[PDB]
Structure formats: structure tokens, C-alpha cells
Enzyme design. Structure first.
Site, PDB file in Angstrom:
ATOM      1  N   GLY A  89     -71.065   5.123 -25.283  1.00  0.00           N
ATOM      2  CA  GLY A  89     -72.200   5.231 -24.248  1.00  0.00           C
ATOM      3  C   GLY A  89     -72.465   3.893 -23.600  1.00  0.00           C
ATOM      4  N   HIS A 127     -64.158   6.974 -14.900  1.00  0.00           N
ATOM      5  CA  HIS A 127     -63.729   7.634 -16.257  1.00  0.00           C
ATOM      6  C   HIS A 127     -64.934   8.605 -16.900  1.00  0.00           C
ATOM      7  CE1 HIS A 127     -64.680   4.255 -19.221  1.00  0.00           C
ATOM      8  NE2 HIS A 127     -65.468   5.363 -19.822  1.00  0.00           N
ATOM      9  N   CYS A 155     -70.501   1.893 -21.506  1.00  0.00           N
ATOM     10  CA  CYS A 155     -69.730   1.740 -20.227  1.00  0.00           C
ATOM     11  C   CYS A 155     -70.799   2.092 -19.181  1.00  0.00           C
ATOM     12  CB  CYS A 155     -68.588   3.220 -20.255  1.00  0.00           C
ATOM     13  SG  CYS A 155     -67.222   2.329 -21.031  1.00  0.00           S
TER      14      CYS A 155
END
Ligand SMILES: *CC(=O)Nc1nc2c(OC)cccc2s1
Ligand SMILES: *CC(=O)Nc1nc2c(OC)cccc2s1
Lengths: 304, 304
Positions: free
Chosen positions: B143, B41, B145
Site C-alpha cells: 500500500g 502499476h 507505492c
């Protein structure tokens, strides 16, 4: 979202841990530039620990009696001295992995990360607070001495603790990196009882702010209080008195949540008086007091 | 003595964290040998996240659209592919700090350390468990991830988690390092509710053993029980059923303390039925279930 008891990343400190052996005593040392710092009781036998005279024990010790091992390579000791309760072992090689660092003596209520080490090898990392009685509630087995406590500001490690002692009540005592004990503790196997473990009120309040920020709000009530009224309840529950300095320190959390510090005090007052009634706050059944306001801001804002 | 929620030292993983930017989406990647692993993603806008077709979104992306930054040096992307929910970015440089590593898919009840990262920079480390509902209760801001979960066996990092999603209920979902989600979660901004967060019974029991070992014994009672009788009480309190496999796994803690597993079950049964009555176990007011038997042995024996 989510709020966790979070340690600083340990890499910068992992690169500083060595093994120090004097005779048959092995513990951990901190290698910064060309100095290795370790607890002076590395020179003691268990017999010595009952009533050690360190200056006298030290006369029987030369540079070559201090065996310093960094991974599987031996460091050459070219000097040694005692500063308070630590030994400084001058080695012929500057630690190539030396981070930017400072030595800071923290105040009670201040939090830091511990890198638990055995035989100069890191086993784990956890977050502690200097208790108001100048103990820490650590996890320290035999060989753990010389393990250090630290904060990191971006790339600068501030070393604040070195592990020295377990008290017969299973809590922990140690020094700053100048070898001065936190509180009245000594590196002697003697009768040493901790005072009252009071709760760090400003830290609980900080953590109540962290909870509101992360969606746990059931304990917000319709009441306010004053510092003096709150402090009467603090006294009763062995909570540190709250000062205007604490209120000011909580200002940013106040601002972000829009909950006045004294209103959060009133929430804490009701929680002290009424208990949690079987409810949890950030997955805890008691009031957490080992997050500072600075810790809550850092974790709630994502500083690295 | 003392027992703490303890993370693995993070140094070996700190040396693997990079920043990955695709268009205006920045998150973290894991650099092992000449591959950077990140959540797929990274290619999505917030608009994309409502109903992404990843294969279609990926066609619009070339190697040069994936900006990989390790500290302040840029890595050259010479290949990219999607494996389940992760991207593998082939770079022209092997990570010089690559540790010995494995990719392992953990079972619910298994614990691991998370190194929370923002912009490829570590902010902190904490201990998690894969919940029985295949969520984790993390601390993950925007941020975060691409932050990974890991265990260390001596010098070998087993990566078990990569952070992908926050559920609207503030709990966390992610993948193993083959990009397969834990549980039924998807990398789509949609309705995704977690099932029952059941308590990891074998972990509570492990932690009751840790308490006895560290001097907290008030909850030891005169009773025993059977797996079937205990399991009736487990059911009622949303505790995982205890199996003979769990009993066997607790064998070493049984041996060291001399408390039969089923007797400790009877202690847990009374604690479930009677509550803590305002008492604490290892400084907790609730039953801790994010220590494995292996975690208790490790911390109680001082493995590095
Ligand atoms: C805190 C800690 O690890 N202390 C240690 N003391 C000794 C010792 O004292 C007599 C002998 C051998 C190892 C250790 S570690
Ligand atoms: C988990 C995490 O950090 N997710 C992120 N998603 C975005 C995003 O999505 C549209 C845009 C910018 C930055 C991040 S981080």
C-alpha cells in the site's frame, strides 16, 4: 520491508508554531485554541539566565510586551500567566489549525517526534527518546527553544515535550506542556550534569524483533536466559533492568516472530558480550534503543 | 548543538496525498493542481505484475475506473494518460492545498525526505539518499507505492521520488515525477539485482565536519593526503571516488571548522583502515553517508 527511524508527519504541529518575542529574546511558541505556550525564559536576557527570579522578572512584563507572530500576522495578547516553567499567553484568536490534542508527560524510554523550529518556522523533524537520565539527544540551535515533542494517535496530537535548555555536554532538557521539567533540570544557566545515559533494554529488544521481521537474523543464537541472568549482564553494560512488564509489552512481537522474549534476551546478551564483530543490524553498527515496541508494531504493520 | 537525521516538515506534502484505487489495487497518489500522479502499476493485478503490457492493460481502463479519494471526499477523474511509469489523472478540482512545487530528478548521493503513506494517509517521515546503485533504503509496506520523496527550499517542494518497487533484497526502486525510474529498474515482478551499494564519500566527509562542529573530534589525526592517494583507499573500501567538485562543495564546512578538506580525507582514510575501535561519532558506530554538505550547513545553521 525496510525499517527506518521515522517521525510522525508534522503538518498538524506545523500549524501550531508561532514566534514569541519578549524584549530582545525571540523563541518559538505553541498556539492551541486561544493560548500560546512558550518557555518562561523568553522574559530573560543572557544575564538574567545566570540567576533568574522569574516571578520578579514577570512583574516588569505586560500583555503588550509579548509579541506573538503566526506567519506574518500578529496575535493580540489579552492575558498571560506562568505555569511552572512555561508561559501561557491568552490571545484574542483561537488557532484555526488547532488539531485534536492532549498534553501527556511521558516516561523515560518513550519516543516522540520533534519539530525543530526557528522564529516560529519549522526547519525539520526527527524521532527522539526521553533518556533514562531525562535528557534527550536533540538537534537544537539558538532560537530552537519552544520547539515541541509529540506523538500522534490517528488525528490526536499528544504533546509531551517543549525544548528549554542545552547542558554544557550538548544534550537537551525541557518540560511537558504543564511546564514541569523532565528530570532534575532547571531553566538556569548553571552547573547541571546528566546522570548515566543507560540503554533502554526493552527498546533494543523491540528493534531486534524489527530486524528479524525485516530479514536481519545473523544474531539469533541457540541460547535462552532468565530475567535475573539477563539483568546481571544488563547491569554490567549500563542497560535498564528488564521487568516482566517489558516482557509482556514485547508479547505481540514474540507472537509474530515466534521467538520467545527470553530467547531474544539471550541474543542481546551474546551481542553485549561479543559485540557485532563488524556486522550491522538494520544498517546500524550499534544496538538502537529509540524504537519502542509500539513503534516497531506501528512501522511493521503500517498504521496511519 | 546535537546533529540528527532530520526530515523536512511534511505538512505541505501531507496536503497532496490521495488514495487511488483501480479495480482491486489501492495505492497512494500525489494531487498537485488538478492532476493526481500515481504509479502506473495501479492498473495491475499481482498476476499482471509478472509480465505487464501497460499500454494494453490501460486500454481496458476509463476515467471512471480510477477512484481518487482525498480524505473522505471523492475526486472526479476527467482525463488520464501514462507518462513513462506514472499515470496522470486529471481531476475536475485543483488541490486547494497545492504548495509551490517543482519536479526534480536527483543524482545519486542526494538526500530527500519520504512521507510514507498507506491508503492516501501519512504514517511517517524519514530521510533517505539516492544510493550510488540508484536504490533507496526505505521503509515501505504493501500500500506504500505512490509515497513520494521531496526536498523543500523555504516554501517550494521539489518532488524527486515516487515509490514503485521492492527488490527481493528488501531495498527500494522508484521514479522521478515524470515517471522515469532511477537506475535500470522496471515496474515488473522479475529478477532485478542492485549493483554495489558504494558509500557516498562526500557525504561521510560532510558528516565528519558536522561531528567536529558538534564536539566529536577524537578521529582528527596529524595526517593529510591527496585526492589520488585517498581515492586508492576509497576504491579498496567501495567508497565513491572523491572529485575536486566534492572538495569545492565541502569548502564552506572547511572554512567554518578550519580543517582543510584533504586533512579530513586523511582522518576518513585512517577510520577506514583502523575502524572505530568501539567508539562512536555523533552516536553512530559506522560512517554516516546520508547527510549532504548542504544538509550539514542547513542543520548546523538552522535554515527554515
Ligand atoms: C533554547 C533557545 O533558543 N534559547 C534562546 N535564548 C535566547 C536568548 O537568551 C538570552 C536571547 C535571544 C534569543 C534566544 S533563543
Ligand atoms: C508498492 C505497493 O504498495 N504496491 C501495491 N501493489 C498492490 C497490488 O498489486 C497487485 C494489489 C493491491 C494493493 C497493492 S499496493
Amino acid at each position: 520491508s525496510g525499517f527506518r527511524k521515522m517521525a510522525f508527519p508534522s503538518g498538524k504541529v506545523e500549524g501550531c508554531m508561532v514566534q514569541v518575542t519578549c524584549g530582545t529574546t525571540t523563541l518559538n511558541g505553541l498556539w492551541l485554541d486561544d493560548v500560546v505556550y512558550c518557555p518562561r525564559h523568553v522574559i530573560c536576557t543572557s544575564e538574567d539566565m545566570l540567576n533568574p527570579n522569574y516571578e520578579d522578572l514577570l512583574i516588569r512584563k505586560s500583555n503588550h510586551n509579548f509579541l506573538v507572530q503566526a506567519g506574518n500576522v500578529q496575535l493580540r495578547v489579552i492575558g498571560h500567566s506562568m505555569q511552572n516553567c512555561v508561559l501561557k499567553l491568552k490571545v484574542d484568536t483561537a488557532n484555526p489549525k488547532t488539531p485534536k490534542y492532549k498534553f501527556v508527560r511521558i516516561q523515560p524510554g518513550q519516543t516522540f517526534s520533534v519539530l525543530a523550529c526557528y522564529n516560529g518556522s519549522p526547519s525539520g523533524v526527527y524521532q527522539c527518546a526521553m533518556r533514562p537520565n531525562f535528557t534527550i539527544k536533540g538537534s537544537f540551535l539558538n532560537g530552537s527553544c519552544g520547539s515541541v515533542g509529540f506523538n500522534i494517535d490517528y488525528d490526536c496530537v499528544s504533546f509531551c515535550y517543549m525544548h528549554h535548555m542545552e547542558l554544557p555536554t550538548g544534550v537537551h532538557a525541557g518540560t511537558d506542556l504543564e511546564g514541569n521539567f523532565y528530570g532534575p533540570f532547571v531553566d538556569r544557566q548553571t552547573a547541571q550534569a546528566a546522570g548515566t545515559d543507560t540503554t533502554i533494554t526493552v527498546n533494543v529488544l523491540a528493534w531486534l524483533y524489527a530486524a528479524v521481521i525485516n530479514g536481519d537474523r545473523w544474531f539469533l543464537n541457540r541460547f535462552t536466559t532468565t530475567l535475573n541472568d539477563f539483568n546481571l549482564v544488563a547491569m554490567k553494560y549500563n542497560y535498564e533492568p528488564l521487568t516482566q512488564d517489558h516482557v509482556d509489552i514485547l508479547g505481540p512481537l514474540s507472537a509474530q516472530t515466534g521467538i520467545a522474549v527470553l530467547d531474544m534476551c539471550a541474543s542481546l546478551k551474546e551481542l553485549l558480550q561479543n559485540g557485532m564483530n563488524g556486522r550491522t543490524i538494520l544498517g546500524s553498527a550499534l544496538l538502537e534503543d529509540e524504537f519502542t515496541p509500539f513503534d516497531v508494531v506501528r512501522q511493521c504493520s503500517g498504521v496511519t
